[PDB]
Design a protein around this ligand. Sequence first.
Ligand SMILES: CCCCCCCCCC(=O)OC[C@H](COP(=O)([O-])OCCN)OC(=O)CCCCCCCCC
Ligand SMILES: CCCN(CCC)S(=O)(=O)c1ccc(C(=O)O)cc1
Lengths: 165, 488, 95
Amino acid sequence: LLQALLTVLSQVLRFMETEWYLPLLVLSLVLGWLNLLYYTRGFQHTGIYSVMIQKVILRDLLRFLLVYLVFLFGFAVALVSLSREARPYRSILDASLELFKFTIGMGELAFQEQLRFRGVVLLLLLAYVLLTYVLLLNMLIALMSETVNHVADNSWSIWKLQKAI
Amino acid sequence: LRACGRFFQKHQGTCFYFGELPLSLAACTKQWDVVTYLLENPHQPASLEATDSLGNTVLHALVMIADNSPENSALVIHMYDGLLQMGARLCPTVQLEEISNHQGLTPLKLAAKEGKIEIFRHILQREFSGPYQPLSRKFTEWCYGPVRVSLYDLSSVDSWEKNSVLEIIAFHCKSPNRHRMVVLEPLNKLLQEKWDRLVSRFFFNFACYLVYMFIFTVVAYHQPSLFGESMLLLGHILILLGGIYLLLGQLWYFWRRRLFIWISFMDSYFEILFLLQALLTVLSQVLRFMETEWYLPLLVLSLVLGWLNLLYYTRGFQHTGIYSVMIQKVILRDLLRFLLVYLVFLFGFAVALVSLSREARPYRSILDASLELFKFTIGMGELAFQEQLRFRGVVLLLLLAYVLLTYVLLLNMLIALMSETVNHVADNSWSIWKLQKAISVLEMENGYWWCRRKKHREGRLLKVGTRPDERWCFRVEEVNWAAWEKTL
Amino acid sequence: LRACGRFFQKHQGTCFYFGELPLSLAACTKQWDVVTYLLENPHQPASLEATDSLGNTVLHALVMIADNSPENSALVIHMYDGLLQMGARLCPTVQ
Ligand SMILES: CCCCCCCCCC(=O)OC[C@H](COP(=O)([O-])OCCN)OC(=O)CCCCCCCCC
Ligand SMILES: CCCN(CCC)S(=O)(=O)c1ccc(C(=O)O)cc1
């Protein structure tokens, strides 16, 4: 439904000649490729796997996200505030994206010589990294304790229900 | 006679505590024919009222011999009920469970303090009929199909009274099973009734901390280089006053909880973190009035710590609350031990890389080399055959050795955490969250440090027999189809 | 008579739904000697067709008392089959 709405809206915005048609057309395109994963239920082999891949619900990741976004934005406002003085964390979006890069293996640590309080900026980054790795490790171990419990694999039955619907 | 020497005292060494008197010995050994003889003989009767060097009666001594195994529990429970029945015949004017030891504890308060959950549940939910009905704490009011309606005696339980079972479980007990005690009847429904009348105050306290942290963030983001200037001054005095208010409220918490202070923060470290945030806030405003540059690091550390402090209020909802408990799995217990091994590898290879990189043919300092070595743990470590160095091949072999040792250590640490944490034990996170709600409520029931509110009794004053036997009793309705159908 | 007040309705609170009528109570409690008496007595027989305030018969009420545990299932199943066999003798024209 959402892909079809965004598709019709993108064509309405294209007839209005507004630039924002292209973001809607491109969001409809991504969502339309993700929609082809529906038809994986037509075969037993992919179908049942599409059910096995539901293990980690948004139930826990949306809760972890609350804790993670408080760490992210709390350290982002702090790094921007402290980096104002020279002796670059220029905005909350800039510092949030630099702090998020640590979760994808891309985070820059430097003793950043051009700043005043550079040592406190480095200690804030080291504290954010250590807290985030404690949080991610706790989140992963808490998912294993909930999901890896040797209960019978009901994925064949849940796929037979997808076929029934 | 009181066997009171160091062998007969309770301690971690070689001892046998049973109380100190013959009757308490005969009860703790399960000699019911010696107990009735010592009580009923004509030559010299024992008294159930008699106390040892801690002020413990035989009923306190029975709570002291309890472990939570089912056989020891059944034997302590049979002996405890037998001695109450005996007291109802030999000293019927005396309430044996109202006798306090030298710590001010009755047998029920001692069972709560010492974490004796099986005898604690038994005393709290006890019921009898015919001659012993006045010895009950639970009274069935009516039963119809799967539904039982009961009155529970709240006399030493409700937090309206000083040093109650609720205050003891929350703040004076140090047993790991505190969270199992708060989910028993009548404590479960009683704590829910207290939560439901305080949940609006909990989210008012959260909203005031959100407004304080919003003002803190707006002010920290608009600091000048070392109308809007007047609003920035207003923001600094609101941060000063909020910092003083939180500081006074937290110092008052640690003053009220001074007798048990080393446990008052053990599952409640947010009382340390709220105190520390308030201190660093007040210090940042003092340093700002002194015009020293170091005010800004303190203001910014207070800001970070204040956003981390908002994670306290996740306990207000079942969904986030219980998850905040599930996310405690990996304690600092193992990561602080792993950190010892990791910091020896880090600094041992850092001094080595700095020493060997001195010669050309850049690891310039211990901080530089420590940060380059730490970058391997976050997926950012540079490996190069570093051509400008003398011994470049040995520098590369030191880096490859550090990487392989660190990946062996991290893999060992992760596998050792899985072996400790992923063991299919029952998910007690709901109970530990009900204990967080219990601690929060028992704090909110006092009101604020400046407001000191009056408390109200819960349950109703009701006649239960002769035992007239009038008590503050709390109505609980249990529906239990699975227990009921087994009786048919 | 239909015990129909809020205690006898199905909801998340404190209640005992069994249907609302004596026969549905006697079936939901497993009193098979009260069920046959209420059905077969000469003074006033119960009807298996009788419905409560939701339109539930005693067979709907038995489905409503079911949990998926093996003992509760065996007891609901025995009572349900017994009442169909009784209907085959007391109201044989009625499905
Ligand atoms: C001298 C009397 C002053 C009366 C002020 C009345 C304020 C009412 C709001 C209130 O107490 O909110 C509590 C909140 C901290 O939450 P908590 O108590 O659960 O604590 C957390 C426990 N884990 O507190 C805050 O967030 C601070 C609010 C900002 C300061 C208010 C003005 C102060 C003037 C001196
Ligand atoms: C207030 C309601 C009481 N009723 C139950 C309603 C379903 S009752 O039918 O009057 C009743 C039943 C059983 C007992 C008993 O066993 O003690 C007492 C009273």
